[PDB]
From Swiss-Prot, chain E:
<feature type="transmembrane region" description="Helical">
    <location>
        <begin position="351"/>
        <end position="371"/>
    </location>
</feature>
<keyword id="KW-0813">Transport</keyword>
<dbReference type="Pfam" id="PF01059">
    <property type="entry name" value="Oxidored_q5_N"/>
</dbReference>
<feature type="transmembrane region" description="Helical">
    <location>
        <begin position="256"/>
        <end position="276"/>
    </location>
</feature>
<dbReference type="InterPro" id="IPR000260">
    <property type="entry name" value="NADH4_N"/>
</dbReference>
Curated annotation (Swiss-Prot), chain F:
<comment type="similarity">
    <text>Belongs to the complex I subunit 4L family.</text>
</comment>
<keyword id="KW-1133">Transmembrane helix</keyword>
<keyword id="KW-0679">Respiratory chain</keyword>
<keyword id="KW-0999">Mitochondrion inner membrane</keyword>
<dbReference type="GO" id="GO:0008137">
    <property type="term" value="F:NADH dehydrogenase (ubiquinone) activity"/>
</dbReference>
Swiss-Prot record, chain J:
<comment type="function">
    <text>Core subunit of the mitochondrial membrane respiratory chain NADH dehydrogenase (Complex I) which catalyzes electron transfer from NADH through the respiratory chain, using ubiquinone as an electron acceptor. Essential for the catalytic activity and assembly of complex I.</text>
</comment>
<comment type="similarity">
    <text>Belongs to the complex I subunit 5 family.</text>
</comment>
<protein>
    <recommendedName>
        <fullName>NADH-ubiquinone oxidoreductase chain 5</fullName>
    </recommendedName>
</protein>
<comment type="subunit">
    <text>Core subunit of respiratory chain NADH dehydrogenase (Complex I) which is composed of 45 different subunits.</text>
</comment>
<feature type="transmembrane region" description="Helical">
    <location>
        <begin position="31"/>
        <end position="51"/>
    </location>
</feature>
UniProtKB/Swiss-Prot annotation, chain L:
<keyword id="KW-0830">Ubiquinone</keyword>
<dbReference type="GO" id="GO:0006120">
    <property type="term" value="P:mitochondrial electron transport, NADH to ubiquinone"/>
</dbReference>
<dbReference type="InterPro" id="IPR050175">
    <property type="entry name" value="Complex_I_Subunit_2"/>
</dbReference>
<keyword id="KW-0249">Electron transport</keyword>
<protein>
    <recommendedName>
        <fullName>NADH-ubiquinone oxidoreductase chain 2</fullName>
        <ecNumber>7.1.1.2</ecNumber>
    </recommendedName>
</protein>
Length: 53, 102, 319, 140, 459, 98, 64, 71, 46, 55, 52, 347, 119
């Protein structure tokens, strides 16, 4: 069971480590930044099957 | 030179007679045995069996039996009076059909 | 009861209940030689509490009501029948022996719990080590099948290997003809039917194995026959005994806590009394055991948890 | 495995014969290698040549069972000429059970394997005939 | 129905907080009060079944079996001492409460709307009888008896669950009206044949049929009287009623696929009537007698005539009464002499002078004495099967001849001719056993007077 | 595809088979487990260096320290095994049979 | 009691499945069963074909 | 007549009980069939709000001008 | 009386029974209060 | 003959003997380590390359 | 006499309670009161009911 | 042992399992499994016999290679589409290795060889906590990572787990090995329904944890390792016998009793999918894994074995063992049949 | 089935669970929970060798109170879950009328089903 203490207590203890394109300490990008931004916004609020296809 | 046991010779047979010749089926307590005989014949036969006989002897018309008797008598007299033969065949209306054509 | 880990964290240790009178002394002698006379002498001349001889009905004497229960429940031992006929093929030597093993083990656990529980040191007599010596000499006379010796050896393997040995052992030596004269001066005829070669084999194994197996575990004091009161010598030789060896040097606190929580709830101690091997001389059929358990429930003081028992109290079941 | 079961069921039944029995021998060799791999992993046969002998025995027995299974399937297809009834693989499973009893050299093992393999081979043809899915929908 | 259910729950702590020498009278008295209460059920009429709201209903098939069950309970509850009347108070209360809970799941099983509820209460009917016969089986193979019992009945009754969940999730809910009123005829695939084989084979296990009949006899001869009578009467006729429910679906395929089960049932009826002609161990002859009559029942169920269903329910109820009585007589004979065999304790015409009348009346209602309900059932089954086929009447009358033969051989073997004059311990009859006899054979003859009750829904 | 990844994964599988099959000592098995550990270290570190995945570069050093204390627990268990026997062989473990 | 224990529970041990016992079991167990099943097939084929032809005596044949 | 009056239940009551139970469980059966069809098409297409396994969430994604011009 | 030197209990302590009865009465009054609030919420909203 | 001994050899006996044989060949393993890890190795190989799972 | 013995009176209390609970269940199932096509009369003549 | 140290290590097991539950990052899932290992090792060797030494050695080796194969699968996941999100994977190879690592970690028939050996030589508290939490913790991960698994993996593991956990158990008379074989069978049941509706799997996890708690509590109440000791505890206490009856038959799963509800609901939401031969094969093996329960019952409560004396001695002393929480879990574990619609309590 | 506002954390009972009517007093399922609590207290008195049906009545009162409380919360959660399932189902029916057409209900005067008698 994927609990939601992460969202209920609100303190993002782990969401910075998770993807690329987060707040890097010196603001430098990764290799595929814009491709990730487009793919994440493409598959953001989508039902993970039509997001797949 | 060993026994593998420690118990009594099984069993110890106790005749339920020969301490109470006035006893019924179970144990030698003389009051409650009479209580059992009284309850099994009064509350088992005298209030159950003959009352159940009078109950199942007559009750409403089971499976609407004599209702069907008197209904059939009135229906046969009805159809004899109206000239048509009794038990019109094709119980469902032959005009009320939509046959699959071929 | 106020115990457990919570008591171990509230009151930190049990090393505060120490030392130099809080000790396990054990007076081991032959039958009717090393007895409660010298045991009560050193108990009342050392400031130290005493436990009686671990007889048949000690399990009924140590708990519940003071009345010893009849031998349909505490038995079926019949110590007088053992002194009469130690050759009956119905089985009376080893059932008595296993009952006495449970008795010695119970009083040993009681002594260890009382030593831990706020002092103040205890004396034992005819302990568990003398118990296996006693049965091995009984087998030197040859009354018991060797299969059953293997069973008792397995019981000795399982039970003894969890406990600490006592601190000292006062060994008392009385020769064979003197014990013969003492038991002839006693006057119990069932006890008068005992022989002398059995007692000789007791002394032979009891000097040949027991005293080598001490070996500064249970440091020894070997005393002669008429060396008896003579309380000054035994008290003084305890008072400069120079405790050096034995596994009492390493606890430090933790084994003492684990022994306090192992001895209490004494069914933990008695989980290893029935192993079983099923012992064709010992075991009991089903119907006899059922009627004996139902008659044991039909004793007025032992039915359904005597802490909660009716007819004695406690007028608090809350209507 | 996947490609040889696909090429087994791709051949119609039908008489495109002895290609089917070759595929059945490959089925038997693969299953015998499976069982021999687990057996050499759980026995320590001591020595290695004894282990090779055990693997060869198991693989040849399973290949022979599959071979005579496919052969009497083909012969039943040629004689009865009905591609639907599971009685042909009932004959096939009982033939495989009798070959297993022959290569263990017993009687009751062969009869029980006749019964079990006949019922299961009939169920295999029957479930392929109606169409019963491999392991899953997996949808709802 | 819940007014016929909740006093059985309230009858459970009666046995617990009834004190010593008092549990017996209270349990018997109040179970007979429940017998009156269930005698008040019979109201069903004409067009429809009688709904006892949404959870419950009753056809006119479940009603006589239910009244039979709650009448059979006080008979058993008085039957089940003198082998545990000297045991402990707590274990005695546990035994009686287990019988009451067993009755509760029997009534739950007979009064079912949904077949899932029926299946849950079916194996709930299974589980206590296991404990009862294993604990008080009184012979050295009761372990094997209960083990074969539970393993045969679960291992057969298990694909019924999958098939019923399948019918649940493909054709709506499982009301018997809505299993009715909506069922389309399912044609001859092979999957339809497997589903029919699953349901019918599960209840074939429960009947038993001939291929699975060694389920029974160990679980009777190595079992006490209470579990024996519950087992035979209510469990076998409960399996019969379950098939009478579930056979409404799958009509166009049972014609083509129901030939071999008729076959195994007929040939096993013949061979089972033959097998119980020669055996010792008197208790087992009634068990194989029950196997013969239930094979006749299965022939009657799998042919699908209203005549056959009327004969089926008559044979069910009459054979339940007859087998329960004759088991009680074999219990009485074993309590007299502790042998269980047949050739040993002969005589018993001189001694026990009116027990012979009960052996006679039980053996003649087992003989199908013709005004009794047993011959009504057997007769209409013979009529429907001669309408089914013109040649099966030889097997039916051959069953009839050999059935008369072994029943009357049982009568003139153990209770005819010569006391062996080494027995010299048996006491004359108690009033309790004769009271159980009068509990047995008065309802059978009263139903023989008025038999329009027990005939089925196709009256 | 950075062809070095092929040989590093091949070396991983070689270390995995070396972890699985072993005949004489448990120490060489635990050492090949350490080698497998180093293989995962190296592969993840080369990827994070190549992809410039710069924020979550915690992985190599944290995988290192954690699986190192795993190896420490393994050394404690092997010292206990060598204490309760004469040796630390793969054999002489034929008590507690399945 | 020796005769009863020999006759009831000493049947299944001891036993070995031989050729003779298997042939006798399959001759007495499936033989007459498939015999009566063949003759029921025969009688049912005759009745089915006859009432499909309709030449049956069912002017009144009510109680089926 | 007296037994029918004082101990039994009327046929009209039974008949309307039958019609009520058939109406209720007809609603049950039709809701259950619609339930399974909705579930299977919602798995097959994913348009519904049920079988939405949690994708990437962009609330932690914050764009800003970096150090490298071609990001 | 009747017990050799060891009743482990028998005279029941009064902190524990008072604590259990107090928290059980607290839980009864809390569930009745919460049920009243839920019925009030439903009859307000609809 | 037919009922008792043959019906007990067909429905109980084959099932119970098969369960006894499979039990005494599966759970009766001597307690070593190298055999278990070689079984893991052949499980990995027989899952990857013989009967595929990732393809 | 009730406190003299109350064990014997338990199942009539249970049966009356179950009878009343089945009456309350049938009152809970109070739909289709007159809406049939076979038993269809008006509420007559006193007060608005035809079965309880 | 010190109680402070034991309560701290219990807190670390709780912390590791909660970190496995809550963390959206893969590294923290691996750290949670590792911390669970590092804390669960001194729960074993609570005594000092070489039994616990060998058991914790075997457990440590299989546990550690499971953890490292999981890290292998995660680094392959980042070789493909690279982000530390608990989601659909991006490789049949990485999902294959991940399901095999969680089958090693969980207990599954190609990798189940360590479970009876590790349960033979440990105290019952350690066995209880390892069975409960080590069957709990990977199920959360599988519940998360379900949508990208080839079903051949899960289904072959499940079928083989149910049949091997059945076929082992007929020959073993140690109580711990019986419970371990029952664990392998129930984890096969809880693995089989993962790709269909995982609410069933987590409800079956709740039910099986309650059942295992009742079982090892009823064996904590009396220091018993063989069935002969169970006959002696028949002799010394009667209520333990009927609870062994009801709880062992609830492990058996009969319809009046609560252990049938996890089987039955699985067959429901398994047969609304159109696989039917797989449910009937699984449920025939559910008939198979009941015989060792049944002979356990026949040893304990329904036959009466001969008993050694000194139970004559033991009848004086009370049953003064403490129970952690026995009766609540008992009647929750047996009488939970008529609460069928509490399926919806989970999602 | 899956959240349906898992975004929107776990939320043991949402605020929309106050819109549905609560489970009433003396509902039968919570009454069964109370009976199970009484049986739990009785078997607790049966584990230790105290006299049953006596000398544990504060434990009886506590067990019955706690189990009725927990069962009340679980019934509220159950009711919310079934209600939100019904709302999602009917909203998905309303959202797509194209995918699920209704059957043309031909009457039994013109439904042809073959007969296949039994004899
Ligand atoms: C004997 C097993 C009976 C299992 C339950 C009944 C059943 O569906 O059997 C048919 C089952 C399989 O048939 P089935 O249930 O797949 O039927 C076809 C259904 N559709 C068209 C939806 C796929 O038979 C077996 O499992 C073989 C035994
Ligand atoms: C169509 C319906 C067909 C129904 C078939 C049912 C299965 C076959 C019969 C099951 C019962 C078998 C049984 O109980 O055999 C007895 C045997 C124990 O006998 P015994 O050697 O005396 O052991 C006493 C303890 N030593 O017990 C054993 O050996 C038990 C062996 C396991 C049996 C499990 C039940 C069958 C599972 C089948 C799976 C496929």
């Amino acid at each position: 069971p994927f609990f939601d203490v992460q969202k209920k207590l609100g303190v993002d203890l782990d969401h910075w480590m998770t993807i690329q394109s987060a707040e890097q300490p010196h603001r430098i990008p990764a290799r595929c930044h814009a491709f990730e931004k487009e793919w994440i916004e493409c598959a953001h609020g989508i039902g993970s099957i039509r997001a797949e296809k | 030179p060993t026994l593998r046991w420690q118990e009594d010779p099984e069993p110890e047979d106790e005749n339920l007679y020969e301490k109470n010749p006035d006893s019924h089926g179970y144990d030698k307590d003389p009051a409650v045995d009479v209580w059992n005989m009284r309850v099994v014949f009064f509350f088992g036969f005298s209030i159950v069996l003959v009352l159940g006989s009078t109950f199942v002897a007559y009750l409403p018309d089971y499976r609407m039996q004599e209702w069907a008797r008197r209904e059939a008598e009135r229906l046969v007299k009805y159809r004899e009076a109206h000239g048509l033969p009794l038990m019109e065949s094709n119980c469902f209306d032959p005009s009320k059909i939509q046959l699959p054509e071929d | 009861l106020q115990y457990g880990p919570l008591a171990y964290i509230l009151g930190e240790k049990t090393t505060k209940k120490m030392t130099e009178n809080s000790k396990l002394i054990t007076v081991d002698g032959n039958i009717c030689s090393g007895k409660s006379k010298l045991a009560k002498e050193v108990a009342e001349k050392l400031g130290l509490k005493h436990f009686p001889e671990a007889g048949i009905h000690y399990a009924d004497s140590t708990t519940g009501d003071g009345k010893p229960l009849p031998v349909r429940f505490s038995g079926n031992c019949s110590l007088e029948k053992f002194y009469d006929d130690p050759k009956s093929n119905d089985g009376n030597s080893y059932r008595l022996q296993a009952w006495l093993y449970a008795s010695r083990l119970l009083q040993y656990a009681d002594a260890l719990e009382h030593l831990l529980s706020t002092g103040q040191g205890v004396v034992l007599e005819r302990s568990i080590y003398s118990d296996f010596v006693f049965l091995e000499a009984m087998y030197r006379q040859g009354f018991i099948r060797k299969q059953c010796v293997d069973h008792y050896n397995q019981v000795k393997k399982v039970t003894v290997c969890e406990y600490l040995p006592p601190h000292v052992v006062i060994y008392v030596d009385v020769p064979v003809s003197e014990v013969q004269s003492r038991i002839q001066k006693k006057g119990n005829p069932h006890e008068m039917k005992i022989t002398s070669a059995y007692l000789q084999d007791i002394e032979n194994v009891y000097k040949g194995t027991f005293l080598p197996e001490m070996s500064e575990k249970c440091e020894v004091l070997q005393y002669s026959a008429w060396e008896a009161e003579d309380a000054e010598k035994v008290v003084e030789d305890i008072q400069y005994l120079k405790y050096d060896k034995g596994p009492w040097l390493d606890q430090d606190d933790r084994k003492l806590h684990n022994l306090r929580m192992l001895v209490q709830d004494k069914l933990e101690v008695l989980n290893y009394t029935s192993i079983p091997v099923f012992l064709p001389e010992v075991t009991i059929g089903a119907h006899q055991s059922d009627r004996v358990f139902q008659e044991f429930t039909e004793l007025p003081g032992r039915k359904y948890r005597a802490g909660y028992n009716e007819d004695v109290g406690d007028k608090w079941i809350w209507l | 495995a996947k490609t040889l079961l696909h090429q087994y069921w791709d051949i119609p039944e039908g008489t495109e014969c002895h290609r089917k029995t070759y595929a059945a021998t490959s089925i038997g060799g693969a299953s015998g290698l499976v069982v021999s791999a687990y057996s050499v992993a759980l026995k320590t046969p001591t020595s290695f040549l004894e282990g090779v002998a055990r693997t060869g025995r198991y693989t040849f027995t399973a290949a022979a069972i599959g071979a005579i299974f496919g052969l009497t399937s083909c012969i039943s297809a040629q004689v009865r000429e009905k591609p639907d009834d599971p009685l042909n693989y009932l004959i096939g499973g009982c033939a495989g059970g009798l070959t297993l009893g022959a290569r263990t050299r017993s009687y009751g093992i062969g009869a029980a394997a006749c019964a079990y393999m006949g019922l299961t081979a009939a169920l295999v043809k029957m479930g392929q005939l109606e169409g019963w899915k491999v392991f899953a929908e997996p949808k709802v | 129905m819940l007014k016929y259910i909740i006093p059985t729950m309230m009858l459970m702590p009666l046995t617990w907080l009834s004190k010593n020498s008092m549990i017996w009278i209270n349990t018997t008295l109040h179970s007979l009060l429940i017998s009156l209460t269930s005698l008040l059920l019979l109201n069903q009429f004409g067009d429809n079944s009688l709904n006892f709201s949404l959870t419950f209903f009753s056809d006119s098939l479940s009603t006589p079996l239910l009244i039979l069950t709650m009448w059979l309970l006080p008979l058993m509850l008085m039957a089940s001492q003198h082998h545990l009347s000297k045991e402990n108070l707590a274990r005695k209360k546990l035994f009686i409460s287990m019988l009451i809970l067993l009755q509760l799941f029997l009534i739950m099983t007979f009064t079912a709307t949904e077949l899932i509820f029926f299946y849950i209460m079916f194996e709930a009917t299974l589980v206590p009888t296991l404990i009862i016969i294993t604990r008080w089986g009184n012979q050295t193979e009761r372990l094997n008896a209960g083990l074969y019992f539970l393993f045969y009945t679960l291992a057969g009754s298990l694909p019924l669950l999958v098939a019923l969940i399948y019918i649940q999730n493909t054709m709506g809910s499982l009301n018997f009206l809505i299993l009715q009123y909506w069922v389309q005829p399912m044609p001859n695939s092979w999957s339809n044949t497997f589903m029919w084989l699953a349901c019918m084979m599960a209840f074939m296990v429960k009947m038993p049929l001939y291929g699975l009949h060694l389920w029974l006899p160990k679980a009777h001869v190595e079992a006490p009287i209470a579990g024996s009578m519950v087992l035979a009467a209510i469990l076998l006729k409960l399996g019969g009623y379950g098939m009478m429910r579930i056979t409404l679906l799958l009509n166009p395929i049972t014609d083509f696929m129901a030939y071999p089960f008729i076959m195994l049932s007929l040939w096993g009826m013949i061979m089972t009537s033959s097998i119980c002609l020669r055996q010792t161990d008197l208790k087992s002859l009634i068990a194989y007698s029950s196997v013969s009559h239930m094979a006749l029942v299965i022939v009657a169920i799998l042919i699908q005539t209203p005549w056959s269903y009327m004969g089926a329910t008559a044979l069910m109820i009459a054979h339940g009464l007859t087998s329960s009585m004759l088991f009680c007589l074999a219990n009485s004979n074993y309590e007299r002499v502790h042998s269980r065999t047949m050739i040993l304790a002969r005589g018993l015409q001189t001694l026990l002078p009116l027990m012979a009348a009960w052996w006679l009346l039980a053996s003649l209602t087992n003989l199908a004495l013709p005004p009794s309900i047993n011959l009504i059932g057997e007769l209409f089954v013979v009529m429907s099967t001669f309408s089914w086929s013109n040649i099966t009447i030889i097997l039916m009358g051959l069953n009839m001849v050999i059935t008369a033969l072994y029943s009357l051989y049982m009568l003139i073997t153990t209770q005819r001719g010569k006391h062996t004059h080494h027995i010299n311990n048996i006491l004359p009859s108690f009033t309790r056993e004769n009271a159980l006899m009068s509990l047995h054979m008065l309802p059978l003859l009263l139903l023989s007077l008025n038999p329009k009750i027990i005939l089925g829904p196709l009256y | 595809m950075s062809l070095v990844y092929m040989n590093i994964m091949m070396a991983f599988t070689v270390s995995l088979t070396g972890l699985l099959m072993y005949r004489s000592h448990l120490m060489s098995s635990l050492l090949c487990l350490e080698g497998m550990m180093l293989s995962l270290f190296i592969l993840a570190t080369l990827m994070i260096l190549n992809s410039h995945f710069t924020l979550a570069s915690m992985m190599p050093i944290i995988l290192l320290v954690f699986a190192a204390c795993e190896a420490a627990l393994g050394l404690s268990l092997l010292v206990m095994v060598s204490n309760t026997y004469g040796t630390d062989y793969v054999q002489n473990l034929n008590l507690l049979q399945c | 009691i020796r005769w009863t224990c020999a006759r009831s529970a000493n049947v299944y041990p001891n036993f070995r499945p031989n050729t003779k016992t298997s042939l006798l079991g399959a001759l007495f167990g499936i033989g007459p069963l498939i015999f009566w099943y063949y003759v029921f097939k025969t009688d049912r084929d005759r009745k089915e074909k006859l009432i499909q032809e309709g030449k049956l005596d069912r002017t009144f044949n009510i109680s089926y | 007549r007296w037994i029918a009056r004082t101990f039994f239940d009327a046929p009209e009551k039974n008949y309307e009980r039958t019609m009520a139970i058939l109406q209720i469980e007809s609603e049950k059966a039709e809701l259950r069939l619609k339930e399974l069809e909705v579930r299977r098409l919602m798995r097959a297409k994913g348009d519904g709000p049920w079988f939405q396994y949690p994708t990437i969430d962009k609330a932690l994604i914050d764009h800003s001008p970096k150090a490298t011009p071609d990001n | 009386k009747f017990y050799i030197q060891e009743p482990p209990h028998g005279s029941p302590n009064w902190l524990k029974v008072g604590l259990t009865l107090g928290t059980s009465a607290f839980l009864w009054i809390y569930l009745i209060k919460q049920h009243n609030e839920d019925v009030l919420e439903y009859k307000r909203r609809n | 003959l037919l009922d008792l001994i043959w019906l007990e050899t067909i429905l109980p006996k084959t099932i119970s003997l098969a369960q006894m044989k499979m039990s005494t060949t599966i759970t009766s393993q001597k307690g070593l380590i190298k055999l278990y890890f070689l079984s893991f190795l052949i499980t990995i190989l027989i899952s990857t390359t013989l009967l595929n799972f990732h393809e | 006499v009730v406190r003299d013995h109350w064990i014997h009176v338990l199942v009539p209390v249970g049966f009356v309670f179950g009878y009343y609970l089945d009456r309350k269940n049938d009152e809970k199932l109070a739909a289709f009161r007159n809406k049939s096509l076979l038993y269809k009369r008006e509420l007559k003549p006193n007060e608005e009911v035809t079965w309880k | 042992m010190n109680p402070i140290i034991l309560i701290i290590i219990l807190m670390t097991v709780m912390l590791g399992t909660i970190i496995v539950m809550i963390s959206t990052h893969w590294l923290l899932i691996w750290i949670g499994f590792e911390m669970n290992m590092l804390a669960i090792i001194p729960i074993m060797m609570k005594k000092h016999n070489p039994r616990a030494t060998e058991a914790s050695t075997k457990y440590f080796l299989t546990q550690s290679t499971a953890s490292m194969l999981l890290m292998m699968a995660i680094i392959i996941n980042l070789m493909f589409s690279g982000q530390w999100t608990v989601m659909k994977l991006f490789n049949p190879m990485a999902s294959m290795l991940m399901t095999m690592a969680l089958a090693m970690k969980l207990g599954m028939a190609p990798f189940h060889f360590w479970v009876p050996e590790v349960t033979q030589g440990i105290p019952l508290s350690s066995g209880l906590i390892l069975l409960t939490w080590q069957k709990l913790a990977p199920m959360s991960v599988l519940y998360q990572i379900l949508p990208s698994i080839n079903l051949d993996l899960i289904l072959t593991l499940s079928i083989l787990s149910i049949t091997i956990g059945g076929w082992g158990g007929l020959n073993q008379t140690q109580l711990r090995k019986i419970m371990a074989y029952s664990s392998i069978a129930h984890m096969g049941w809880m693995t089989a329904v993962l790709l269909y509706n995982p609410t069933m799997t987590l409800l079956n996890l709740i039910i099986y944890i309650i059942m295992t708690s009742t079982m090892f509590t009823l064996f904590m109440a009396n220091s018993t390792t063989t069935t002969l000791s169970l006959s002696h505890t028949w002799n010394k206490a009667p209520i333990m016998t009927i609870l062994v009856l009801i709880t062992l038959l609830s492990m058996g799963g009969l319809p009046p009793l609560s252990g049938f509800m996890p089987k039955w609901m699985i067959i429901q939401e398994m047969t609304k999918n159109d696989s039917i031969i797989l449910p009937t094969l699984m449920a025939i093996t559910a008939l198979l894994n009941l015989y060792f329960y049944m002979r356990l019952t026949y040893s304990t409560a329904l036959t009466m074995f001969p008993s050694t004396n000194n139970m004559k001695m033991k009848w004086q002393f009370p049953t003064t063992k403490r129970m952690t929480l026995l009766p609540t879990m008992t009647v929750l574990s047996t009488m939970l049949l008529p609460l069928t619609p509490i399926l919806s309590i989970l999602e | 089935m899956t959240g349906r506002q898992a975004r929107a954390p776990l939320q043991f009972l949402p605020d929309e669970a106050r819109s549905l009517p609560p489970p009433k007093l003396t509902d039968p399922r919570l009454a069964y929970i109370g009976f199970l609590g009484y049986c739990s207290g009785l078997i607790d008195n049966a584990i230790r060798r105290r006299p049953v049906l006596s000398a544990g009545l504060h434990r009886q009162f506590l067990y019955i109170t706690s189990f009725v409380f927990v069962g009340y919360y679980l019934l509220k959660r159950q009711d919310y879950m079934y209600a939100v399932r019904d709302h999602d189902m009917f909203s998905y029916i309303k959202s797509h009328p194209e995918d699920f057409p209704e059957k043309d209900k031909k009457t039994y005067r013109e439904v042809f089903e073959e007969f296949h008698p039994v004899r």
